[PDB]
Amino acid sequence: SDPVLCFTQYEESSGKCKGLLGGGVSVEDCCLNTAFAYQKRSGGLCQPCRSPRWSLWSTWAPCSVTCSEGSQLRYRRCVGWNGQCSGKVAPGTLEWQLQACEDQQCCPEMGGWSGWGPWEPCSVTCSKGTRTRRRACNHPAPKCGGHCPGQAQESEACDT
Amino acid sequence: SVAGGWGPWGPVSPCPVTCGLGQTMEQRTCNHPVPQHGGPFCAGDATRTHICNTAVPCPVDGEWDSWGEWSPCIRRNMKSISCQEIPGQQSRGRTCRGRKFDGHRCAGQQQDIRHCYSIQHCPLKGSWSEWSTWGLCMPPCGPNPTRARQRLCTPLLPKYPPTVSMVEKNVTFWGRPLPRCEELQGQKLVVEEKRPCLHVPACKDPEE
Ligand SMILES: *[C@@H]1O[C@H](CO)[C@@H](O[C@@H]2O[C@H](CO)[C@@H](O)[C@H](O)[C@H]2NC(C)=O)[C@H](O)[C@H]1NC(C)=O
Ligand SMILES: *[C@@H]1O[C@@H](C)[C@@H](O)[C@@H](O[C@@H]2O[C@H](CO)[C@@H](O)[C@H](O)[C@H]2O)[C@@H]1O
Ligand SMILES: *[C@@H]1O[C@@H](C)[C@@H](O)[C@@H](O[C@@H]2O[C@H](CO)[C@@H](O)[C@H](O)[C@H]2O)[C@@H]1O
Ligand SMILES: *[C@H]1O[C@H](CO)[C@@H](O)[C@H](O)[C@@H]1O
Ligand SMILES: *[C@H]1O[C@H](CO)[C@@H](O)[C@H](O)[C@@H]1O
Ligand SMILES: *[C@H]1O[C@H](CO)[C@@H](O)[C@H](O)[C@@H]1O
Ligand SMILES: *[C@H]1O[C@H](CO)[C@@H](O)[C@H](O)[C@@H]1O
Ligand SMILES: *[C@H]1O[C@H](CO)[C@@H](O)[C@H](O)[C@@H]1O
Ligand SMILES: *[C@H]1O[C@H](CO)[C@@H](O)[C@H](O)[C@@H]1O
Ligand SMILES: *[C@H]1O[C@H](CO)[C@@H](O)[C@H](O)[C@@H]1O
Ligand SMILES: *[C@H]1O[C@H](CO)[C@@H](O)[C@H](O)[C@@H]1O
Ligand SMILES: *[C@H]1O[C@H](CO)[C@@H](O)[C@H](O)[C@@H]1O
Ligand SMILES: *[C@H]1O[C@H](CO)[C@@H](O)[C@H](O)[C@@H]1O
Ligand SMILES: *[C@@H]1O[C@@H](C)[C@@H](O)[C@@H](O)[C@@H]1O
C-alpha cells in the first residue's frame, strides 16, 4: 500500500511512462494489467508491469578529472515487476561499466615572475593622473595555459 | 434554516474494463442533509474522475526467453567431424516464459538449427593480432579497477565453402581451435597489458 503513479503504456524506445491513469494505487493493482507501467515518485524511473528486461545503457558521466587521465561510469537497470533480468537479479538493481577517459593530454603548470619594468606617465593637458608598471612570466613561463600567482600591472598617483 | 451537506462519493457507471484498473466518474448529492428554508447549497463539485479497480488480473501472453548456447557441431552417424571438411549440425533452444491467466502461448520455433564445421581442438597455423583496444575497468564498482588489452594468436581458418546442399545452406565454423604461432614475449597464445584506472569515482544510485 505504497501509492504509485499508474501509466497506460511503456514507450520501449525511450523507456518512458505514457498515459497517466493517476495515483493512490499499489504497484500490485497497477500491474494487474502487464501492459501498464508505474513510477514510485513523480518524474523518476518508469517500470513496466511486464516481465524484467535490461534497460538501455545510460550516457557516459563526465571525466573525474578535467586535465589528466581519469575514468567515467555508466549504468543499465533491471526494469519490470514479476521476476528477474539476467542471473538471479531482481528489478531496480544496476549493472555498471567503468571506462578510462581523458579531457586533455596535459595539465596546467604554474608560472614564476621576472621583474617590474620602468614606469609610464600620467596626463599633461591638465593635472592629477595615474602611473602604472608592468612585468611577465619570463621566468618559469607557464606550461599548459597555466597562470602566474599575483598581478602583472601596478598603479600610483602623480600631481604634475 | 438547514445548510446542505454532501452524501458519500458513489459510482455513476459500471467500471468500463473487465480486468485491472479503469477510468470512471463518481458523483455525490447535496442531501446529507438536504438544504431547507433558505439554507445554503453544498460548496464544491458534485462530480469527479476516479480510477476504478476490478481487482481482476488481465491475461499475460508468454514471451520467449533468450536463445541458449549452440550445442556441439556433430554429424548424425559419425563419432567426430572435427578438423575435417564435413558439415555437421547444432541446435539451441529458448523457453516461453510468463504466460498467465489464459494468455497466449509463444508462436514460432522453440529450437534453432544450423549447419556448422567443427574446428573444436583443431590445430591451425596462426599469426599474432595487433593490440586490442583497452577493455573496461574491472571491477567497475569494486576495489581496484584495472583495464587490459591483448595480442592473440588468431587462427587462419581453412578456405572451405560457405554453403552446402541436399541436391544451398550456410555452414559456420564452431569450436575453439589451437592456433600455432612463433612465441611472442614468452607467450604461445595471449600477450596482455594491464593498467590501473585512475581517479575512480564511487558509483551511487542515481535514484538517491
Ligand atoms: C546465409 O547467410 C547470409 C549472410 O552471410 C544471409 O545473407 C543475407 O540475406 C539477407 C536476406 O534476408 C539479406 O538482407 C542480406 O543482404 C544478405 N547478406 C549479404 C548479401 O551479405 C542469408 O540470409 C543466409 N541464408 C541463406 C539461405 O543463404
Ligand atoms: C578542470 O579543468 C582543467 C583544464 C584543469 O584546469 C583542472 O585543474 C587541475 O586539476 C588537477 C587534478 O584534477 C590538479 O593538477 C589541479 O587541481 C588543477 O590544476 C580543472 O580541475
Ligand atoms: C475482459 O475480460 C478480461 C478477463 C480480459 O479478457 C480482457 O482483455 C484485456 O483487455 C484490457 C482492457 O479492458 C487490455 O489492457 C488487455 O490488453 C486485454 O488482454 C477483456 O476485455
Ligand atoms: C549498451 O550495450 C551495447 C553497446 O555497448 C548496446 O547493446 C546498447 O547500446 C546498450 O545500451
Ligand atoms: C610573482 O609574484 C609574487 C612575488 O611578487 C609571487 O606570488 C611569485 O614569486 C610570483 O612569481
Ligand atoms: C617589482 O617590485 C620590486 C622592485 O620594483 C621588487 O619587489 C621586485 O623586484 C618586483 O619585480
Ligand atoms: C461537501 O464538500 C466538502 C466535503 O468534501 C465540504 O464543502 C462540505 O462538507 C460539503 O458538504
Ligand atoms: C468522497 O471522497 C473521499 C473518499 O473517497 C472523502 O472525501 C469522502 O468520503 C467523500 O465522500
Ligand atoms: C536468439 O537469436 C539471436 C541471437 O543469436 C537474437 O535474435 C535473440 O537474442 C534470440 O534470443
Ligand atoms: C553459437 O554460435 C557462436 C559460437 O560459435 C556464438 O555466437 C554463440 O556461442 C552461439 O551460442
Ligand atoms: C607471432 O605471430 C607471427 C608469427 O607466427 C609474427 O607476425 C609475430 O611477430 C609473432 O612472432
Ligand atoms: C600495439 O602497440 C602499439 C599501439 O599501441 C603498436 O605497436 C601496435 O598497434 C600494437 O598492436
Ligand atoms: C586504450 O587507451 C586509449 C583509450 O583510452 C587509446 O590509446 C586506445 O583506444 C587504447 O585501446
Ligand atoms: C586636456 O585638456 C583639458 C582642458 C581637458 O580637455 C582634459 O580632459 C584633457 O586632459
Residue numbers in the entry:
A (entry chain B): 27 to 186
B (entry chain A): 255 to 421, 426 to 466
What does the primary publication say about this deposited structure?
Properdin is the only known intrinsic positive regulator of the complement system. Properdin stabilizes C3bBb, increasing the half-life of the enzyme complex 5- to 10-fold. Properdin forms seven domains, an N-terminal domain of unknown fold, followed by six thrombospondin type I repeats (TSR) domains. Oligomeric full-length properdin consists of ring-shaped vertices, formed by N- and C-terminal domains of separate protomers.
